[model samples]
Target: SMFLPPPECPVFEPSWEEFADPFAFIHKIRPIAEQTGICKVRPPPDWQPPFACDVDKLHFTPRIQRLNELEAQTRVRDYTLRTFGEMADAFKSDYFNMPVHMVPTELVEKEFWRLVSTIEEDVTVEYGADIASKEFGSGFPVRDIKLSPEEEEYLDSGWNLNNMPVMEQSVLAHITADICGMKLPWLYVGMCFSSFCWHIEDHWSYSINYLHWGEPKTWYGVPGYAAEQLENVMKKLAPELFVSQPDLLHQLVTIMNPNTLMTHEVPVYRTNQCAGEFVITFPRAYHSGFNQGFNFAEAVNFCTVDWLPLGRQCVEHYRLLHRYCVFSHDEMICKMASKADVLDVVVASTVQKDMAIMIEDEKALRETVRKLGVIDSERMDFELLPDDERQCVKCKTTCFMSAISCSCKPGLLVCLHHVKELCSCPPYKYKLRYRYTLDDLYPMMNALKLRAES
Candidate 1:
């Protein structure tokens, strides 16, 4: 699905000052929304209102009302407006002029081309050498992330040998900025349409990720308290705000066990990537899932601003980031991350934009982010329609898994238990409509087709 921006939609004005005290800026937003009668405060568009309350509730709390005040201020680290203006021209070219290429999956896990042979178990690799398990790593069916620690301990030790932000420079900058009373960093981390999987890692300094591929669905309870800014994700996730009639929301929608007493069943989220948008992420947010069924037409640019409410090198403990299993979103912005400079920017921009066809041409990039590469139960079925004859559309049984042994339900597409327990069919209909005895795909296809278009 696509949520094409209306003709007059304003292009995004990239913000350079990504991380600062949330309370400082949040405070000024409500009044602005009242005056304009609209606020970016609301989810962008097409986004479910659930996401709206998720963030608004937290930001509007009585104690949080303090977050209601804010404004943009000029500082030394920010590129001068003139510089920003000039850069925009170059930025446009570099960001979109050329095509992006998927680093061959082979090239991704290792540097050596020879490691492509058999299924050697445990031989993990990075830049080419094994890092995690010595058994030939199966490479990742989903995402590859193993360079940081490996490179640090054995090779570069700091891995930041020539690195700036990941190394002492980022730390040094934090100290200097704090000296001037700035508790935040001097930069921001953001990306266009990328996705990240479940896991936790030290995100150099403070950071936030902007989503732009599909609805960003992140779930983790509120991060530990601190003037912490966790993802501050989707303060307002707008689905229609970006493109028209987006299919993104569909990809992001999935089954989940919302409330659990003790353990988690890996309760996963797909990170589907149709013409989807992205979700925002912050450092220490404990995450995983990057482009679930999609590729990397998405991005995660870095930003670390100096001076703010959080302390120098702020991380580990924070708030504004709720930890949950899934929340749909696109356009993820990471406030602070990545140490590689100019070069990293070029790579980050290039990798994400490549094959990133516009929503109008979703078919072009379809292969890149389709349910391929990812292991998913949902991939088994998209349209929940039923087999005519045997499994009619009215067949509301256990919502039939749409698999082979549907015969278990007799002529029904699903069992009575499914009907009564899952489909919510009226008990009367459950007993009344049992005529058909054959299954077909037509009804499902018909149902899956875009209703508006039909």
Candidate 2:
């Protein structure tokens, strides 16, 4: 057995003043724990959340987990682990069959993976699910009922379910996109051996999860900088999974042992999240985990002033990888600029900085295309075009800021990255289409500053 127990996860205990502004506080402490991907925060002892409900009283449609099958005739049920000892016993007997209670944590983890690695044997005893929010309401901080003063405090806090403070930074938070998973808080119900695969948030944004109540849920994380390392490993294991699949229908995932990652020299950290603790994953961080036993948790995605720049970068990365985007980053930036007057000061400043970067980057790209004899003579009403119509013909990425179009081709476009990939038309025949000029963009940011000061 080559398993080793993970190092303890970092925990931040904030002071009253430090906790006043959750974003600022988290940002301040990022230097210490950001590289770990996942970290825990324990609120002041007095900041207890409200919890009142009979376990049976609250009902939800549970997803059945099958141990040895994924077919029509396979019988399935909830992979229930009623207690910590029971879960450990079942896992040891069914898998390791070792006394985890008496052994060191490292030995337990080592033995557990040894069982998992024997792929030749059908010794797997696995089950778990995330009772998503679409079916059951959020697991914590619901606003429909009266709450304790402590609970009310949290409901009004920056991370509130009703009033997410992060939205203050967005100009279009009031407008909901077609993306449902990232828009709402989701509930997660976990049973023994239930797991989540390694992945990042939808738009390289931050994500927060709170365990409402249950047995400890175990987690493993890798920093955002190491995201590519994990990807390369996955690619090696399943090369086809890395290739672009048709539409958004085809997807791939896997569960891996931490030792395998350690063997490859990839930095990995672990944590055991318990009730009342909050765990947050930084932008682009790759995290994966499994529950120790039956438990309930709630989580949501959010963005801050700091994330605006990364949001744009994520879209560009998605384009390079030929991946689908949940929403247009350029649209969000321009929309915020359009409504700058009411934006928060911190948000306005951050967006203004990111907008400048976007403009400069676009300017450089457009100049590169222009050097190839492309000109900005024709202006397409890009805003009015359907989303599907706005994708670059070559890479199929959403094009908002600047795209090349040709009159000869009528309704076709190509992004700056693939400018030469358009049809056989000469470079001069193509026209650059853009929504705003540098002169207009500056003024939009200026207006945000005015509103922010006001």
Using TM-score, give the best candidate's number: 2
lDDT of 2 at 79: 29
Q: Give the backbone clash total of model 1.
A: 132
Per lDDT, the best of the predicted structures is 2
lDDT of 2 by residue, 1-454 (tens): 3567667668988877886776777788787667898898877676666765544444444554332211111111332324423553566545444443343434434444555456554543444333344334554565665677776666667655435523564333634445566667777766555667667887898888888876667888888888888888767765755667554445555567776677787788898888888898888988877665557777877787777777888988888878766677877787788877777777777777887788888889878998999875555556677678888887778787889888889889889999888889898888888877767778887887676673
Cα lDDT computed for each candidate against the true fold: 0.23, 0.69
Alpha carbon lDDT at 31, candidate 2:
79
lDDT for model 2, please: 0.69
lDDT of 1 by residue, 1-454 (tens): 1111111111221232321223223233323322211112122343321111111121100000000001111111243323322333343235345322332322221211122222352222101111112222111111234445433332322111122224322332322211221121221111221122222322222332222222222222212231122222211222222122112122221111112201222121112222323232333333322121112122221223221212212321211111111110010111111222322333233222221211213232222222222111122331223323222223221122121123224444432222333234333232322211122222322222322123
